[PDB]
Ligand binder design. Structure first.
Ligand SMILES: [Mg+2]
Ligand SMILES: [Mg+2]
Ligand SMILES: [Mg+2]
Ligand SMILES: [Mg+2]
Ligand SMILES: [Mn+2]
Ligand SMILES: [Mn+2]
Ligand SMILES: [Mn+2]
Ligand SMILES: [Zn+2]
Ligand SMILES: [Zn+2]
Lengths: 827, 827
RNA sequence: CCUG
RNA sequence: CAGGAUGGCCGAGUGGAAGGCAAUGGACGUCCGCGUGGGUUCGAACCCCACU
């Protein structure tokens, strides 16, 4: 059999001894020549269909040799192209001859889904009647044929006859619908058996036809076969069995079998019975009829396995991140920008942590990356776990080098030399390469080299020069495939890419949303939870200056919560003040006002709306911008907010796409918004919550949502500390984490209790929401954190004194978490 | 040569006598067999590339024959597929054998444009090196290769030797970069001339390489050419001439020749000169190198011609109506709706006109239409003129039948028998079929049968049954290609399709626009001339009815002009009053108010804006809609309109994309808009007119614009009458025509003067602008026609009391014409 | 196409 | 799973068109032609492939 070799960071199929060279292969017997060719072509087909690899064959001569014309032509028929160099590149060292096979197609959604087939085949076993001949459909022909079948005569005058006269000349030739066959007196009943699988599938697949057996092909004379050599009943049974044996694949309903008419009609000589003439009419078949199973091959597990008929048709006609595939270029330019002329180590925080923890790791890595002048070295605690493989103790870090003039190299740094270290690194490199092709959709020639390094004080395969990353184009394409691959797993870089995906979605929605600035002066923005409301407010405050040419101090931002106005104030895009400061102080020099979380405002101090109206309308440059952002799902009190009636809140814009939270968080927000709708507070006008999220919208970004209940306060603290330490080990910064409690009066208690547990995890710094720039965990109330967001949020015992306010707390908590949310309710 | 036969409604190529049948072709000599095959393939390639046709070949036998396996395989190679039935269907009657060729690629923008090449070819003359072999790229391979080229060793150690030793074994085999050739033993210079085009283009096309001539292919021995047999300098001259003789096509700059190094080295024997060995180092060429001109053919008018190298490369690397192509399905379902179970005659107005003018034409056509139980019979005064062919006097009408179970038939009805009639009908049918394929992009099997009919008292081809329109799908596809074709010519049906395209564009812009209803209660809509303002207002009132569930009479429409008020009232989608009526009467019953042409309003009768605000805001079901439509380019007076200041006119929606007028009218409107901006009025605030149309927006609808200046009044009226008579003869209804004058006071004078000429054109019924629905020509002033539209407009002597408004009156006129506009200014 |  | 096909007929030829019953395939010395179509080769009836 053919089996993939395990000691390689790639699919390596050893096809054994093969005779190479045209002259050497001409001296072979045809049987051995065809057997060796079929072995090598099985290997090539498997590697083409399985992400590419290397075919290893031991050659019977020491000196360099050509592959052989028959092998070359078989590869050409395999790829349906004379461009062999595109998919096959050969090397030879001593007795070993290598063919390096590129993947036929890459990714779950290739750019050629509707053009080229997913599979290469030695044969599709699909035959069509092509005029007077039967020809096999190649991969592309069969792809088009199945793509069509998947959409939702005088010969009959002869066929109707009950009998035929010996030597009768048929009045028609062989054509698209007719075939004549004559067989010897001896083998008639056996030659019919081999005739059926070739002409019945062809007629069935190409509009049907008539098969006359017993008609001289040249003179068209009816001859039949002598009565003594044929039993009509046995012949009919055999033909029926052979026809019904044919493997048919259905794309339709009903799935009735192959339909045909068979007649064994007497041939009379002078009126006496001379023999029997066999006539088959093959009515067109609804779908594809195969003469036998397709000769397509694939590597599954560690074997080279032949694809079944149904599995082949499925591959030929029919966690991946579609958003990642869409934004791969932007995401690559963001996270994996390839610099012009130096080797970049990323993530930089993780690299610093590694070199600090491990003595000599910096010197090791820098001495090892001497040969590389341009590229990126993507570090990780363990690329194995990043790719859903098993963690190996003793592995300090894994670094994926993507440098110029070099192949990708997966480095594994071991604190102590280990026997299984090279096996672990090879497994990780093989998984990475297979993912870069099959999931990342890399259509170029890729090989990830596994290379183990030891901090304490089988040869690699030499790939062609076309597997080296020549320059910017190849490095960027490989890195964009790596982006797509990473967005399919849970890891530090995957989460960073997900954050950038959320930022890109928010930018898209803001591009759609900012076109209202030219159209409105007053505008009440009704954003749903996680809809980007505050990001839109910031970007609109930037665009207001960009358009009206007014200096930043002329734009005012008003919010209810001090943490939010501090966060907005540190952006330097405007002046940011709280509701109370807004009412107290003078702002006659302000032209534009943006008011955010207006549903959280209060009337107890004054008419904030009236003040904003006066300031904006009395502006010198016409009526200034007065945009009031608000979310009624995130109300924080039962009193009237001073907003105008709902009927008065016009013109309106609605941010209904959730773009700030990962999919698990967004689904939870959508679920809880139904609970909010079920019983709105009395200060919430009933018709406001009738805003619904976009029905078919999804973020396509992985998140986390763990709800742990019936746990005590100390258990909550220890779980939070353990999760924080696990994140920080992987490389998440402390400024990605926030702990949100029910109310402020509990903030100090929970701060002390959480420090008590975090002193075991080596970070003893917590802060209120008023400081968001420091690299520290933020502990505060859910309400005080309104408007702000963090990647990882721990929601601790959501609570309020009045059930009329309670429902909104869970939304106001979940909407703060971008990717990871941990909720610890009462129980 | 091969010549297209002229007397058919198709490309019929007569390849003459051909031996058909496998046995008959086997009994031939190879030269004759190959010549007949070459003729048939040239005809088939020409027909594939020229829109399909028929190949006529006389066969030397009477009985039916198969085509022949070599001919079948050549067709398979021609179409790169065993699906011969898709493109070739053969018929034979008597001593004639027909091949019906379908177009390979059809339409200027095929749906497969990026996948399949535009051209079929016998040979691309493009060769590539495939390991140790040179392979000719088929059409698909050459397409991909040219697409790739369009986008923006030890062999060297042997090549560096200035001499070689006889029998020296070269240490390397043949490969992607190396070829070993021996010299011919008989004709050496001729052999080199022959070999150079085989290998130099392949190396140049793939990474270059070395060609060693004089090296044994099998043993790799260096043999060379005997000194007595070859002169090295003459051989060098022949080689360089042959290499520069190779056709090269460049997709770049600079367009350098083929770069190569040619060395003729001494092959010594025992240290003494024996012969010469030729080695060429072919460097990779930047673009495509051909061994000769591509073997691709096409039909040029009446001749079958081969495409040149550069012409072939152009066709292989790369009035057509893009909006027609986009909307073909909707336009077909609008105009050419295929009915179920009866035959439909269109256009009905033209059909009635024809049957009224001509005695017995109805009976004639009905008698001819008995066989057809379903389809559409598309009449015309002259399909020849509709397709830009010369008119033939004596043609009563042309009718294009498109019916089930029948091929397309172009009927030509002649008043009396005519010898030329069949020639005219056949030319028209051929032109129609060629347009349907090459311009309408019909990818099915199409034949238009030409039949001449006569009101008073060559044999046609019989096409395969696949050319008959099977049913709804085939007829719809053919009629959609017909829509695309018609939209590219000036004719009645083309203009009706253009009207529908304008309506579809307006509907799309309204789908964009109506999303503001959910977001705005009060809205000022600022439309540009011809932006659809009034159509949008009508549709928005229709949408208000549904979204607010209010009865139609609860919606009010207020406009300045009585004709527009009447036109809107005639649809019952609201209550429509004039500004004066609105101010005088009471409308507390109204909930929603839409105001149109608000810029023309006046204040002397009251405060309409305040009244509308009050009425809408005190609507019992909450505040209602108050949408004010206005266009400052169509300011009809210099007074105050009562609108709020431009700073106060918010929120604001802008309809910038002109969707109501054909392309010439739209461009004229844009130029007049720029002139208006250069001379703004004093009663229009500063920023009103800074609204600009979408820069690269086009309507894709053909129109007409004639500024017939320097004419007298009588000449103007006679020209108008002649144009109207021509349109009505062609089939346009009078209700498509409006005559617009400068002022209402001259309307009666111009009515008398226009009737003076129209009474000689067999129609006298003019109409006032207040009677739009009548089947009469509307003659009225430009100002009173504001808000109305008609397909053909005649603007006469545009003028105003104060010349300041003349640039505005010109726009107000040009925006009323949907497709055809005639302006008669002062001299 | 015919045949072992 | 394997074998054959040559000139008018019988038939010799597996890489530089016999013989037997003056010639006894063809196009324009070159080329095609040994069932047909291709390929390899300096060279094919001969070797390789597909088809019949
Ligand atoms: Mg013989
Ligand atoms: Mg022999
Ligand atoms: Mg020959
Ligand atoms: Mg042959
Ligand atoms: Mn057959
Ligand atoms: Mn047959
Ligand atoms: Mn060679
Ligand atoms: Zn089926
Ligand atoms: Zn070039």
């Amino acid at each position: 059999p053919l089996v993939v070799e395990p000691s390689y960071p790639d699919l390596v199929i050893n096809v054994g001894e093969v005779t190479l060279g045209e002259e050497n292969r001409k001296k072979l017997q045809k049987i051995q020549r065809d057997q060796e060719k079929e072995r090598v072509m099985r290997a090539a087909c498997a590697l083409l269909n399985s992400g590419g690899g290397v075919i290893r064959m031991a050659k019977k001569v020491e000196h360099p040799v050509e592959m052989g014309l028959d092998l070359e032509q078989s590869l050409r028929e395999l790829i349906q192209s004379s461009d062999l160099q595109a998919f096959f590149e050969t090397k030879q060292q001593g007795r070993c001859f290598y063919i390096f096979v590129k993947s036929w197609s890459s990714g779950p959604f290739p750019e050629d889904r509707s053009v080229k087939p997913r599979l290469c085949s030695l044969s599709s076993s699909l035959y069509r009647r092509s005029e007077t001949s039967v020809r096999s459909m190649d991969s592309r022909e069969a792809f088009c044929f199945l793509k069509t079948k998947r959409k939702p005569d005088p010969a009959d005058l002869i066929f109707q006859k009950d009998y035929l006269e010996y030597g009768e000349i048929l009045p028609f030739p062989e054509s698209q619908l007719v075939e004549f066959k004559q067989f010897s007196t001896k083998h008639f009943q056996e030659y019919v058996k081999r005739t059926i699988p070739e002409y019945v599938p062809a007629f069935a697949n190409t509009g049907g036809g008539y098969l006359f057996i017993g008609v001289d092909d040249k003179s068209r004379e009816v001859l039949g076969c002598a009565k003594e050599n044929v039993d009509p009943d046995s012949l009919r049974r055999k033909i029926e069995q052979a026809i019904y044996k044919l493997p048919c694949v259905h794309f339709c309903q009903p799935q009735r079998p192959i339909t045909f008419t068979l007649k064994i009609v007497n041939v009379l000589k002078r009126g006496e019975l001379y023999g029997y003439a066999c006539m088959i009419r093959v009515n067109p078949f609804c779908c594809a009829v195969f003469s036998e199973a397709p000769n397509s091959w694939i590597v599954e597990d560690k074997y080279v396995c032949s694809l079944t008929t149904e599995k082949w048709v499925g591959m030929m006609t029919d966690v991946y991140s579609k958003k990642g595939l869409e934004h791969k270029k932007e995401l690559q330019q963001l996270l994996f920008s390839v610099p012009p002329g130096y080797l970049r180590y990323t993530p930089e925080s993780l690299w610093r942590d590694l070199i600090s923890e491990h003595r000599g790791l910096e010197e090791l890595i820098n001495k090892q990356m001497q040969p590389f002048f341009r590229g990126i070295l993507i570090f990780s605690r363990s690329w194995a776990v990043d790719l859903n493989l098993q963690e190996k103790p003793g592995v300090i870090c894994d670094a994926l080098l993507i440098a110029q003039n070099s192949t990708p190299i997966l480095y594994t740094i071991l604190r102590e030399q280990d026997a299984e270290g090279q096996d672990y690194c090879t497994r990780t490199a093989f998984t990475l390469k297979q993912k870069l092709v099959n999931m990342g959709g890399y259509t170029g020639k890729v090989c990830v080299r596994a290379k183990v390094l030891c901090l304490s004080p089988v040869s690699p395969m030499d790939y062609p020069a076309s597997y080296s990353l020549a320059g910017t184009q190849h490095m960027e394409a490989l890195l964009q495939s790596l982006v797509i691959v990473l967005l399919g797993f849970r890891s530090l870089l995957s989460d960073q890419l997900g954050c950038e995906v959320l930022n890109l979605l928010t930018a898209q929605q803001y591009e759609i949303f900012s076109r209202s600035l030219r159209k409105n002066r007053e505008l009440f923005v009704h954003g749903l939870p996680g809809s980007g409301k505050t990001i839109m407010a910031m970007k609109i405050m930037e665009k207001i200056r960009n358009v009206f040419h007014c200096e930043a101090h002329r734009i005012l931002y008003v919010c209810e919560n001090q943490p939010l106005r501090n966060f907005i104030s540190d952006r330097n895009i405007c002046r940011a003040e709280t509701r109370k400061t807004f009412l107290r102080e003078n702002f006659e020099h302000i032209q534009h006002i943006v008011i955010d979380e207006a549903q959280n405002f209060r009337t107890e101090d004054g008419d904030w709306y009236g003040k904003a109206k006066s300031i904006t309308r009395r502006a010198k440059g016409g009526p200034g911008i007065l945009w009031i952002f608000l979310d009624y799902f995130q109300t924080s009190h039962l009193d009237c907010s001073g907003l105008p009636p709902l009927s008065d809140q016009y013109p309106r814009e609605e941010l209904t796409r959730i773009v700030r939270n990962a999919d698990p968080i967004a689904k939870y927000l959508q679920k809880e918004m139904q609970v909010i709708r079920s019983n709105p507070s009395f200060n919430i006008p009933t018709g406001c919550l009738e805003v619904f999220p976009e029905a078919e919208w999804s973020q396509g970004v992985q998140g986390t949502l763990r709800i742990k209940k019936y746990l005590t306060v100390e258990q909550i603290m220890t779980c939070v500390a353990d999760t924080c330490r696990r994140f920080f080990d992987r490389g998440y910064s402390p400024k990605d984490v926030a702990v949100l409690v029910s109310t402020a009066k509990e903030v100090e208690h929970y701060k002390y209790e959480l420090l008590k547990a975090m002193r075991k995890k080596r970070v003893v710094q917590l802060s209120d929401a008023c400081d968001m720039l420091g690299d520290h965990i933020v502990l505060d109330s859910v309400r005080r954190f309104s408007g702000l967001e963090r990647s990882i949020v721990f929601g601790i015992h959501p609570r309020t004194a009045d059930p009329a306010i309670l429902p909104n707390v869970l939304i106001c908590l979940a909407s703060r978490a971008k990717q990871h949310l941990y909720i610890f309710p009462w129980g």
